[PDB]
Every structure is written in C-alpha cells, then in structure tokens.
Design a protein around this ligand. Sequence first.
Ligand SMILES: *[C@@H]1O[C@H](CO)[C@@H](O)[C@H](O)[C@H]1NC(C)=O
Lengths: 53, 171
Amino acid sequence: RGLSSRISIYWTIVKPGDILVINSNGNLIAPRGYFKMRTGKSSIMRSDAPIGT
Amino acid sequence: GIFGAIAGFIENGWEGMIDGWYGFRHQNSEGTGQAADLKSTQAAIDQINGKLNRVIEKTNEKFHQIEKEFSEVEGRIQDLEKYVEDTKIDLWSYNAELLVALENQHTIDLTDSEMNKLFEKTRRQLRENAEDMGNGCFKIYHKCDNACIGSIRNGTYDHDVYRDEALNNRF
Ligand SMILES: *[C@@H]1O[C@H](CO)[C@@H](O)[C@H](O)[C@H]1NC(C)=O
C-alpha cells in the first residue's frame, strides 16, 4: 500500500493500583487511551456462513 | 438375546400386534384372539426412555477455546495445539462408539428379559392346569372361554377352580 516501512503493534495490560509508564526517544506510536477489559462468554470464529434471523 | 426368548424359543414377532410390544394370542372354543400386555410393554419403554434421557441430555456449553485450524506453518506450539485437539477427538470418538455398543447390547437383552418375564409370570399363574409347549405357547387342559383367558391376562386366574378338570385331562 505504498510503503516499505512498517508498524509493530504491542499491548500492555495494567491492573488497578498499577501504573503505566511510557518512555520514548522516538519511533513511538502512542496509545490514545485504553480499551476496557471484561470477562465472559465472548469469543471469535472464522466463517463465511451467512448470518440469518 | 441372553434369555433366549426373543429370536429364541419364541419363533418370531407379530407384525400384526400394533397396540403393544408384548401380548397374548389365544385360541379356544369361542375363536381366536389377540391382546397387548401394557404393563410389560411399559416396563420396556420406561427403561429404554430412562436410557434415552441419560444420553440425549443437555450438552456442554463451551465458549472461547483454542484455535483448531491454521494458515501458517508455525512448528512446535501448533504441533501441540493440533495434537491436543486430535487427542480429545479420538478419546470422545471412542466413548461414543462404546456407549452405543454397550447400550444397544443391553437394550436387546432387557427387551428379551421382559418377554421372558411375562412368559414366566403366566406359567406360574397357570399352575398344574397347563403345559409349556416350548414355542412360547401354553396348552391349557381345561375349558377356557374368552372370560377365562381374560382372567389369565389381567392376573386374576384362579387355578383351583379348573385344577380338577385340567388334572383329569392332563393324565
Ligand atoms: C379380570 O377379568 C375379569 C373377567 O373378565 C374381570 O371380572 C375382572 O374385573 C378383571 N380384573 C381386573 C383387576 O381388571
């Protein structure tokens, strides 16, 4: 898509009471915030099957 | 089966009996008749259902699991994920095959059992007034009209009544 360059994606989970610290002298692609984490019955599947009512 | 009644000393089944699993056919002075035995039919059906309900019961709910297909060759970890799933499937496949074999063998044996039990119950009722013809038929040595046959079927037959007559005709 035009580029010979790349971005590498990483993740960090921070539990309550912990602290995030980000330190960069450059090349950093910074987070804009956080995604809420939940536990439950959710999951993911690969399928081409049409969804139907 | 294991009691030798069904496909046993009882030659074959009656396609003509549509109202029960087990019953009586009789021939006496008045004519021929056929009637289903509902108690033993029920015994069989109940057991078979009990079992059917054991097996058909609620399945297990699972949500997020390991991935079972792969688009890239990764080596070790994929080898392991693949091996685990394959192991699981082989074991459950075994459980199912065996469940069916055992259960079926037992169903065959228990239905045979019910038949034989009805036969035995009846023979015991009749006491000295009849003989086992070996084909699953009794020979009744006194005069038995439709009421009397009925009394045999609903378990109220009083042998002492006909004992003299029958004893006489047997010997
Ligand atoms: C059995 O049959 C006899 C004669 O048909 C009848 O009088 C009697 O009530 C029956 N017994 C039962 C418990 O159904």
